[PDB]
PDB file of C-alpha atoms in Angstrom:
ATOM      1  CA  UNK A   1     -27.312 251.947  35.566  1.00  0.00           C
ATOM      2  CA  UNK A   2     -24.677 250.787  32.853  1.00  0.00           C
ATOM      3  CA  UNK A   3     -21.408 249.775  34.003  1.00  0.00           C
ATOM      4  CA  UNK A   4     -18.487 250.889  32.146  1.00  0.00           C
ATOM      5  CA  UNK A   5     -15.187 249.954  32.463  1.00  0.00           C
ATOM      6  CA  UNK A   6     -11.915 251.920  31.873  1.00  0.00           C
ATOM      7  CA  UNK A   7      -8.906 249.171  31.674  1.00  0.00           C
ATOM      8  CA  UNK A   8      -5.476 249.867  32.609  1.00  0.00           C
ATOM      9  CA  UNK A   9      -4.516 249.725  28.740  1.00  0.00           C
ATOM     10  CA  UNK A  10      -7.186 252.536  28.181  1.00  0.00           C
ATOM     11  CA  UNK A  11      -5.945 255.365  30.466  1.00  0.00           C
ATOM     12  CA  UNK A  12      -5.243 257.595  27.575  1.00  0.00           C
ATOM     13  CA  UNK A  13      -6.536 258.745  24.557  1.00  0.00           C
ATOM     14  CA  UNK A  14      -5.784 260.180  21.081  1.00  0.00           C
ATOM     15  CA  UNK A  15      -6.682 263.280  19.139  1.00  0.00           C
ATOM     16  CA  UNK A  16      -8.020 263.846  15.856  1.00  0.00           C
ATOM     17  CA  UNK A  17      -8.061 267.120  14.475  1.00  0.00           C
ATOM     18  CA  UNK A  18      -9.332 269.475  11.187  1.00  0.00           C
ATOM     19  CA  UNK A  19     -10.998 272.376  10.500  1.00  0.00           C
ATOM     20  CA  UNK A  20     -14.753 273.276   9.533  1.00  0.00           C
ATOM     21  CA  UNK A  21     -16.584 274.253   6.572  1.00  0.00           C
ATOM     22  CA  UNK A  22     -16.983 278.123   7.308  1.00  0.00           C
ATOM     23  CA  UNK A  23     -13.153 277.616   7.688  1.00  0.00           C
ATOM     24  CA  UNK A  24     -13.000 276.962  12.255  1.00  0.00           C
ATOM     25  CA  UNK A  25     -10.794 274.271  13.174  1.00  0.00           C
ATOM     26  CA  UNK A  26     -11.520 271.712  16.223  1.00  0.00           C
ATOM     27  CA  UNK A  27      -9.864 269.035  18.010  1.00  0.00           C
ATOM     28  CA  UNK A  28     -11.590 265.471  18.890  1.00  0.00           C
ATOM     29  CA  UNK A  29     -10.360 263.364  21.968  1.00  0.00           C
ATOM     30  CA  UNK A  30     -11.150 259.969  22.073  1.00  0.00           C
ATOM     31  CA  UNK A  31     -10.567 257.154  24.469  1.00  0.00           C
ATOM     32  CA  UNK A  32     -11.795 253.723  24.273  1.00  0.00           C
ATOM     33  CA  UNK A  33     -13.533 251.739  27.293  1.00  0.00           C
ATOM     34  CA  UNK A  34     -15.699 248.696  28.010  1.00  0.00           C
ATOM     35  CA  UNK A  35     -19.451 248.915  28.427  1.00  0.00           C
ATOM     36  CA  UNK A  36     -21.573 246.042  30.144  1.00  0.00           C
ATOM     37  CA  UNK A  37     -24.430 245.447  27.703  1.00  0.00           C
ATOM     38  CA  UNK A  38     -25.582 242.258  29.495  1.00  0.00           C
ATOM     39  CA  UNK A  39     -23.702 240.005  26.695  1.00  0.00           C
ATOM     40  CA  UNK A  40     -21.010 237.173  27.989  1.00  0.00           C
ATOM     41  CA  UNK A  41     -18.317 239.617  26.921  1.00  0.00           C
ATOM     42  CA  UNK A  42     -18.607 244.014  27.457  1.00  0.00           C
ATOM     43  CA  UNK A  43     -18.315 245.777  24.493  1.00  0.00           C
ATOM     44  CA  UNK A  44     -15.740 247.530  23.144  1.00  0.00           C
ATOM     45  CA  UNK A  45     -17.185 251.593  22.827  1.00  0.00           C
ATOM     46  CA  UNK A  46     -15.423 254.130  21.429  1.00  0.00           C
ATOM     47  CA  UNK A  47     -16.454 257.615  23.795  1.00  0.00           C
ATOM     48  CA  UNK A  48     -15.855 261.632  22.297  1.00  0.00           C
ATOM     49  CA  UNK A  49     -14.601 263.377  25.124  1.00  0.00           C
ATOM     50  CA  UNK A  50     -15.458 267.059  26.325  1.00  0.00           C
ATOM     51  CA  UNK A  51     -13.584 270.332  25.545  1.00  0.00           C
ATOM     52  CA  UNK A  52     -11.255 271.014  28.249  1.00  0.00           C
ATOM     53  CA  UNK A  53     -11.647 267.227  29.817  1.00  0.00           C
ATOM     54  CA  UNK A  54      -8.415 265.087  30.303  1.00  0.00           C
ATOM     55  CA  UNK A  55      -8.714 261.135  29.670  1.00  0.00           C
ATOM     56  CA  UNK A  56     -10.679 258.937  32.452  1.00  0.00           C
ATOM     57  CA  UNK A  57      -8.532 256.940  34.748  1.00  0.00           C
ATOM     58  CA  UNK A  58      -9.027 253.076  34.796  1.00  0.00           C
ATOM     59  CA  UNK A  59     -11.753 252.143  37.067  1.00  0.00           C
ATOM     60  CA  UNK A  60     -15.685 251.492  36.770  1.00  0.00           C
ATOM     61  CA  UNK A  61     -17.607 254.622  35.920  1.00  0.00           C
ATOM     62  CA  UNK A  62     -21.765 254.879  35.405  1.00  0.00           C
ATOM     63  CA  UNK A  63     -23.342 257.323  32.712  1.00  0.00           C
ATOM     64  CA  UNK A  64     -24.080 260.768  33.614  1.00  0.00           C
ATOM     65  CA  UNK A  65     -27.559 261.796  32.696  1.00  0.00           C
ATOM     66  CA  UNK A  66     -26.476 264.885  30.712  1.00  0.00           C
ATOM     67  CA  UNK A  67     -25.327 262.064  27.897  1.00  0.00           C
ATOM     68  CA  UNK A  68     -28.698 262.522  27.099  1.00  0.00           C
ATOM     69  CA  UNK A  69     -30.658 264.520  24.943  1.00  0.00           C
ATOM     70  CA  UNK A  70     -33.841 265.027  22.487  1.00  0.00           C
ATOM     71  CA  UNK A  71     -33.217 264.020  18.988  1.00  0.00           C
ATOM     72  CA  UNK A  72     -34.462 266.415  16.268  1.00  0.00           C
ATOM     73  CA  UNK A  73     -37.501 263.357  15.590  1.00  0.00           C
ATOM     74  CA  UNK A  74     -38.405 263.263  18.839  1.00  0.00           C
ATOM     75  CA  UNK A  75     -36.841 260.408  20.699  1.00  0.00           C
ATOM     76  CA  UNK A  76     -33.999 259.907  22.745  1.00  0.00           C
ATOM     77  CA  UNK A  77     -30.375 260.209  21.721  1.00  0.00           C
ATOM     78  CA  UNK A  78     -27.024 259.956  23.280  1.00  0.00           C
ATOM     79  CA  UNK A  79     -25.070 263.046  22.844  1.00  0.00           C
ATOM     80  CA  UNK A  80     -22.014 262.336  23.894  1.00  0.00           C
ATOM     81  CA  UNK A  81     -21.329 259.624  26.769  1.00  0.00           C
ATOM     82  CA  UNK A  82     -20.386 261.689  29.923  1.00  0.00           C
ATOM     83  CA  UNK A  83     -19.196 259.280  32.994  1.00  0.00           C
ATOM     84  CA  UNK A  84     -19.129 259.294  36.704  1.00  0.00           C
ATOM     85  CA  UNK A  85     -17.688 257.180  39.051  1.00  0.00           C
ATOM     86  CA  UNK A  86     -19.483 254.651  40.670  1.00  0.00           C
ATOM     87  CA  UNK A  87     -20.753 253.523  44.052  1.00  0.00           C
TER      88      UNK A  87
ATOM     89  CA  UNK B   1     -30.811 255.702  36.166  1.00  0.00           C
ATOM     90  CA  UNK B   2     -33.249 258.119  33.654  1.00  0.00           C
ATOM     91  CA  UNK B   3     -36.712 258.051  35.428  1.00  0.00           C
ATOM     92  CA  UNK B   4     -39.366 258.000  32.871  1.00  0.00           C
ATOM     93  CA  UNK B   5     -42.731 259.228  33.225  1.00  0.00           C
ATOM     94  CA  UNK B   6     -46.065 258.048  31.977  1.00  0.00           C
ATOM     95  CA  UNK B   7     -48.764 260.362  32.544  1.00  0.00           C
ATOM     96  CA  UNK B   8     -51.852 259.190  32.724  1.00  0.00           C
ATOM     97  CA  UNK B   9     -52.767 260.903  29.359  1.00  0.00           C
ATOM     98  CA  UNK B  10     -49.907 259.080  27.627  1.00  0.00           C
ATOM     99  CA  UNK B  11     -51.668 255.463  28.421  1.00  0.00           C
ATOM    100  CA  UNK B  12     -52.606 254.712  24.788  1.00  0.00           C
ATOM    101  CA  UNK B  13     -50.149 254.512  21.512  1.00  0.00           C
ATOM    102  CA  UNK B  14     -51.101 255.484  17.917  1.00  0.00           C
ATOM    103  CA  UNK B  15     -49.977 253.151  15.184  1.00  0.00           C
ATOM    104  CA  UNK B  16     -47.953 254.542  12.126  1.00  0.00           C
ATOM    105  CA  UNK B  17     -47.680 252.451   9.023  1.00  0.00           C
ATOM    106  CA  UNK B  18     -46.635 251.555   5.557  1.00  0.00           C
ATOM    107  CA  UNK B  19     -44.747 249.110   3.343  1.00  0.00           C
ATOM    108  CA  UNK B  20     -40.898 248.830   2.679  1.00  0.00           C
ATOM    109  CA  UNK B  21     -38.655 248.825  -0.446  1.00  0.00           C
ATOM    110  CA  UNK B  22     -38.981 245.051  -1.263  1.00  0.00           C
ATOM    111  CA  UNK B  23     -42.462 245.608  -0.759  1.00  0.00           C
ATOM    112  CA  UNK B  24     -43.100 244.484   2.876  1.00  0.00           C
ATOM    113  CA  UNK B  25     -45.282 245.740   5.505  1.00  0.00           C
ATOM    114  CA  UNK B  26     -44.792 247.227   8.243  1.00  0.00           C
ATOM    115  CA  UNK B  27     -46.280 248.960  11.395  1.00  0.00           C
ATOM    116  CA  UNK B  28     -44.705 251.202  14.395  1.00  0.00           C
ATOM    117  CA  UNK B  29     -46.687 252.089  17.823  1.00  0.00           C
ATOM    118  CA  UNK B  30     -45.671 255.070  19.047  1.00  0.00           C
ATOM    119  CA  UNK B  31     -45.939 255.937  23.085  1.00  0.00           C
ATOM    120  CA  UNK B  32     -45.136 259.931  24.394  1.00  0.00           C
ATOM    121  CA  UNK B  33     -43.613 260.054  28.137  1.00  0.00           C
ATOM    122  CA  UNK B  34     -41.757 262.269  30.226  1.00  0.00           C
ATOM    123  CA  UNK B  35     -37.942 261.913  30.896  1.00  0.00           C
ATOM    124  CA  UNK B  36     -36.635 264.074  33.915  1.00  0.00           C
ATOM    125  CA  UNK B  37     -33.285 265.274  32.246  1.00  0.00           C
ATOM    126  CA  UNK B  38     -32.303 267.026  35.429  1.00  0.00           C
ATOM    127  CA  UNK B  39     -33.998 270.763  33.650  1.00  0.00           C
ATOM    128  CA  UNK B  40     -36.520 272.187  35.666  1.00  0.00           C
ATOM    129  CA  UNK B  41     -39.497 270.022  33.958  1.00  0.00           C
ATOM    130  CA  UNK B  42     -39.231 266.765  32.755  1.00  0.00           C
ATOM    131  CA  UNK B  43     -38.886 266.855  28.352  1.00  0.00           C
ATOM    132  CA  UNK B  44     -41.495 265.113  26.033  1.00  0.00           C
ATOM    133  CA  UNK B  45     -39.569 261.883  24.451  1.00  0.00           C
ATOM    134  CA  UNK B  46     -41.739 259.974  21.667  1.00  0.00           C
ATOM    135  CA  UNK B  47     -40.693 255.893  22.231  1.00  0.00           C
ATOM    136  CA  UNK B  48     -41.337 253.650  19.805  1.00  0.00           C
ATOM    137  CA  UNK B  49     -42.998 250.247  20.941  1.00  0.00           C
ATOM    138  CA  UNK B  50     -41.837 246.977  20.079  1.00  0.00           C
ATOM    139  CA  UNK B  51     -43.554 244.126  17.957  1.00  0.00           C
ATOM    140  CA  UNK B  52     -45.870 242.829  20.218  1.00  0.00           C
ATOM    141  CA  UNK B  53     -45.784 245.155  22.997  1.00  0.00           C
ATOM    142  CA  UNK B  54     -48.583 246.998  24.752  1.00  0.00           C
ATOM    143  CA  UNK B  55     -48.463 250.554  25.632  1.00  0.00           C
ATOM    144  CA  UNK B  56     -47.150 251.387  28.990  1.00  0.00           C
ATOM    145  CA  UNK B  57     -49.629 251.959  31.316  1.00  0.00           C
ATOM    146  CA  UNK B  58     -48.877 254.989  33.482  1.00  0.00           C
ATOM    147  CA  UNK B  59     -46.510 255.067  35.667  1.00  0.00           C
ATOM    148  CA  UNK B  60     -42.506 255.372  36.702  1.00  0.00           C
ATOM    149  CA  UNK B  61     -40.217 253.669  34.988  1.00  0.00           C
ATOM    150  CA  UNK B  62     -36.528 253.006  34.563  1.00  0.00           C
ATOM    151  CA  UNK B  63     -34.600 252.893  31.139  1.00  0.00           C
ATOM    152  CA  UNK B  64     -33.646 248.819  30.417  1.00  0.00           C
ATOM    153  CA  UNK B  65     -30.302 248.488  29.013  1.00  0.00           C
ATOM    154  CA  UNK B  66     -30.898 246.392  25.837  1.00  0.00           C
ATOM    155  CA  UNK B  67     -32.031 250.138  24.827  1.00  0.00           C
ATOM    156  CA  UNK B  68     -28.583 250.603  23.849  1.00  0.00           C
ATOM    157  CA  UNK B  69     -26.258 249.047  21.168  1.00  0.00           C
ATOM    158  CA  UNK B  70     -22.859 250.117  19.764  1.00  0.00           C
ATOM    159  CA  UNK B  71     -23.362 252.086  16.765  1.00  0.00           C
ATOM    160  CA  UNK B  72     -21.382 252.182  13.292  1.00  0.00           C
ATOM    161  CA  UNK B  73     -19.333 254.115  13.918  1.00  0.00           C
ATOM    162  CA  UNK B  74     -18.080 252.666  17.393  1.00  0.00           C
ATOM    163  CA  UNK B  75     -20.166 254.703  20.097  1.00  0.00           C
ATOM    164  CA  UNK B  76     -22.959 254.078  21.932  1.00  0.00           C
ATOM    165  CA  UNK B  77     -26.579 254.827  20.841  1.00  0.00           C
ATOM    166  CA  UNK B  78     -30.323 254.004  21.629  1.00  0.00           C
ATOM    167  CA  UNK B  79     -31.427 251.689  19.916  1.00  0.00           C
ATOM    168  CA  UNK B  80     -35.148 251.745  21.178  1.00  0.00           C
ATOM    169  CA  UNK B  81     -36.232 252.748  24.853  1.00  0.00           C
ATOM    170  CA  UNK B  82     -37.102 249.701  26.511  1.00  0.00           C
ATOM    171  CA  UNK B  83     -38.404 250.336  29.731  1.00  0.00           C
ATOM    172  CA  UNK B  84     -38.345 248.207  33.105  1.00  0.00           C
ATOM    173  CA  UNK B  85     -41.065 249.575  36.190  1.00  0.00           C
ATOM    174  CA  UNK B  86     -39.118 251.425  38.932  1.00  0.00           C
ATOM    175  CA  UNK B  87     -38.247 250.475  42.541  1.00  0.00           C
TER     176      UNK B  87
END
């Protein structure tokens, strides 16, 4: 159950592009947001989001399960963090 | 909310060790669970223990979030799974 927070001042993101190695291009979208990691203070996160998926609005979002996956040593990774909203 | 599994086969860790660079010790329990990742089974996750810690004995369980830290390169990652009985 994390707790992360989108701020009004985070409602958008940016785009950094390029192209591959066997010559394919791609497109990165990033937007920044707040995560609740039971400090004083959340932490500033930087999150990758998905092909084809537009910036989260402000509010307070949970993590989707599918952020989740098995790393090639055997343990737990994050893949890429995937939100929901909460409540 | 990941629910983690302990099976009762899985109530025992094995101990993996060696010595570091500037020549110190070290030793790492590892502990094998489930984690339902919303597939049809639930996947095989190897979790390192921390110094001090006792295997989990089996059982559900909840991932704790001091499991996660910001990474360097601004995201989120698991740091270790830390894990907190369900319910």
């Amino acid at each position: 159950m994390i707790k992360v927070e989108i701020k009004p001042s985070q409602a958008q993101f940016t785009t950094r592009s390029g192209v591959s190695r066997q010559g394919k291009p791609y497109s990165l979208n990033e937007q920044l947001c707040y995560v609740d990691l039971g400090n004083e203070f959340p932490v500033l996160v930087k999150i990758t989001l998905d092909e084809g998926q537009p910036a989260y609005a402000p509010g307070l979002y949970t993590v989707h399960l599918s952020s989740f996956k098995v790393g090639q040593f055997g343990s737990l990774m994050i893949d890429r963090l995937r939100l929901v909203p909460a409540k």
